[PDB]
Ligand binder design. Structure first.
Ligand SMILES: *[C@@H](Cc1nccs1)C(=O)N1CCN(c2nc(OC[C@@]34CCCN3C[C@H](F)C4)nc3c(F)c(-c4cc(O)cc5ccc(F)c(C#C)c45)ncc23)CC1
Ligand SMILES: Nc1nc2c(ncn2[C@@H]2O[C@H](COP(=O)(O)OP(=O)(O)O)[C@@H](O)[C@H]2O)c(=O)[nH]1
Ligand SMILES: [Mg+2]
Length: 169
């Protein structure tokens, strides 16, 4: 069976855990310990192909050991998550893209920009800004809400389609 290694990255509090649990369980978690970093597996059918998605939900203290670089290097695709009500989380996206570029030693790594918490009215990052950033990186932009499940399957399934496009090159 085909297997895809996906990694969910972004600032603390953006909804990485909430998005992962929404994809895995179809339930919204109000509280998920921000120190818990773990991987989950879900069997899905995407465009007729059965596959196992192994999703690493990053968390815990920010550190950069060589062991952590090697663990991130195993990721085939990354969701760059920011929250639409947190400008600092959007400003931090460049850091996450640079760290992916550094450990993968590549300019062409499958990624999707995800603007989470789209259910909140307290927007501080406009959709146009996020679309321009994703255009500058050559990647898709998807608006999500882990609370209502808006865009959740689209974010993960779009990342799987980007990994498929990369494996074809
Ligand atoms: C919060 C978890 C909490 N623990 C306790 C209380 S809350 C959470 O979800 N986190 C914490 C932050 N993590 C993390 N943070 C960053 O950068 C954060 C910023 C903001 C403070 C200063 N620092 C630099 C920038 F200004 C942004 N970067 C992380 C990071 F890059 C990696 C990591 C590590 C290595 O070795 C390689 C690597 C390669 C690709 C990657 F995508 C990432 C990632 C992510 C890599 N790990 C954690 C980082 C995690 C989330
Ligand atoms: N309204 C709303 N709250 C969310 C959403 N996603 C996450 N949250 C909340 O934001 C907080 C941080 O979410 P969490 O998944 O722990 O973020 P992480 O640190 O990136 O793993 C929690 O209180 C979640 O319930 C979302 O899309 N909408
Ligand atoms: Mg978390």
């Amino acid at each position: 069976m085909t297997e895809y290694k996906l990694v969910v990255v972004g600032a603390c509090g953006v909804g990485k855990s909430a998005l992962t649990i929404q994809l895995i369980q179809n339930h919204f978690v109000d509280e998920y310990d921000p120190t818990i970093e773990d991987s989950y597996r879900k069997q899905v059918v995407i465009d007729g192909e059965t596959s196992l998605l192994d999703i690493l939900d990053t968390a815990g203290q920010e550190e950069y050991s060589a062991m952590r670089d090697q663990y991130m290097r195993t990721g085939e695709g990354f969701l760059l998550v920011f929250a639409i009500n947190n400008t600092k989380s959007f400003e931090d996206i460049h850091h996450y893209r640079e760290q992916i570029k550094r450990v993968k030693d590549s300019e062409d790594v499958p990624m999707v920009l995800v603007g989470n918490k789209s259910d909140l009215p307290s927007r501080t990052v406009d959709t146009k800004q996020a679309q321009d950033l994703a255009r500058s990186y050559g990647i898709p932009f998807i608006e999500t809400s882990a609370k209502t499940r808006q865009g959740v399957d689209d974010a993960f399934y779009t990342l799987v389609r980007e990994i498929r496009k990369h494996k074809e090159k």
